[PDB]
């Protein structure tokens, strides 16, 4: 055998007088896949069938199971469990998010910010669209490598202290990196008014290069890096 302990955050909105508490579980790792999600699933199916959490791809490419495992925001389907048993894997939901239940935090705001940047191709003349393919050199395309892959796991933006204290008005990395992604997409024609949308104290400028965001990203992406890049466009673009 081989027991590993999991200490996991819990909360039920349908059990009056309940309040945020942790609960431990114990798992023979010989009968369990390597990844943390495997565990949370294995405990759901075998042990406790109350535990509530988000999941789908189990392949680390969809962003459903984002959560704080041992003080760092990642995908549970990609973090392999700590084979060392003296340690007890702690699991919490993503930080400073209103918890709907257990490990299921409310992202509607997160998405709504994603909405607020207009993530799609914009052209001045959309009269010839949907008929010819737009041209883009491989060099112009390469500028998106490192940006286009963003899962929307939201591990980053929810690790940024600026976004903890300013979820309402600050956009956060996830989204800004994508705003940037459209800025330097050659095909797009609205690069300036995209930049114009960020001319306020908060939208962009609550970044203070804390760099927690890039640290925790599940896909090795570098938002901070992209924020910086934005700020440089912001100061040197003309009109």
């Amino acid at each position: 055998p081989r027991i590993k302990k999991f200490a996991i955050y819990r909360w039920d909105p349908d059990k009056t007088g309940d309040k945020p508490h942790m609960q431990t579980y114990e798992i023979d790792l010989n009968n369990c896949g390597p990844m943390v999600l495997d565990a949370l699933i294995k405990i759901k199916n075998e042990i406790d069938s109350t535990l509530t959490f988000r999941r789908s791809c189990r392949e680390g490419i969809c962003g459903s199971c984002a959560m704080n495992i041992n003080g760092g925001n990642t995908l549970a389907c990609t973090r392999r469990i700590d084979t060392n048993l003296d340690k007890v894997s702690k699991i919490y939901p993503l930080p400073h998010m209103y918890v709907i239940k257990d490990l299921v935090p409310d992202l509607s705001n997160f998405y709504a910010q994603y909405k607020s940047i207009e993530p799609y191709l914009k052209k001045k003349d959309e009269s010839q669209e949907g008929k010819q393919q737009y041209l883009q050199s491989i060099e112009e395309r390469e500028k998106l490598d490192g940006l286009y892959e963003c899962i929307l796991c939201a591990c980053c933006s929810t690790s940024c202290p600026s976004y903890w204290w300013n979820g309402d008005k600050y956009l956060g990395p996830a989204v800004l990196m994508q705003a940037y992604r459209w800025m330097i997409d050659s095909r797009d024609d609205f690069t300036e008014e995209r930049l114009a949308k960020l001319q306020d104290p908060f939208s962009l400028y609550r970044c203070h290069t804390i760099m927690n965001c890039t640290g925790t990203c599940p896909k090795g992406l570098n938002p901070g890096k992209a924020i910086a890049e934005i700020k440089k466009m912001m100061a040197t673009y003309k009109e």
Partner: protein, 138 residues
């Protein structure tokens, strides 16, 4: 339903709920970067606090700088205790200064990989101790 309207619904819904807030500072991993920006704030705040008291007492207090030093002098001053005080002045000045440079490199878009942060972050601590110990004996 627009982006603004969604955001509005979120807050109405959640403020008037009985949902908890997920924890943050309590659970989150301590990183050198984290600590190294916290400090940069703290240091900032202490220096301006320092500059303020200095310019303010210039207008509020009696005498002149000489009189206030001659006051200091007559406090059976230890040469170590002077060094201490003098190191205490210049420790956060130099930290913030060196780290400030690192911030300014970043704003030039430079050196934002998890390698480079641990490297530069470490250098700043080294440059800090050296210039601090250096100046505190000039």
């Amino acid at each position: 339903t627009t982006a603004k309207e969604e955001m509005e619904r979120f807050w109405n819904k959640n403020l008037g709920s009985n949902r908890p807030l997920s924890p943050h500072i309590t659970i989150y991993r301590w990183s050198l970067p984290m600590a190294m920006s916290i400090c940069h704030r703290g240091t900032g705040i202490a220096l301006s606090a320092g500059v303020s008291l200095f310019g303010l007492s210039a207008l509020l207090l009696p005498g002149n700088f000489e009189s206030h030093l001659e006051l200091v002098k007559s406090l059976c001053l230890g040469p170590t205790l002077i060094y201490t005080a003098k190191f205490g002045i210049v420790f956060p000045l130099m930290y913030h200064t060196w780290n400030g440079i690192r911030h300014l490199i970043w704003d030039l878009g430079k050196g934002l990989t998890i390698p480079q942060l641990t490297q530069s972050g470490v250098v700043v601590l080294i440059l800090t101790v050296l210039s601090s110990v250096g100046l505190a004996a000039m």
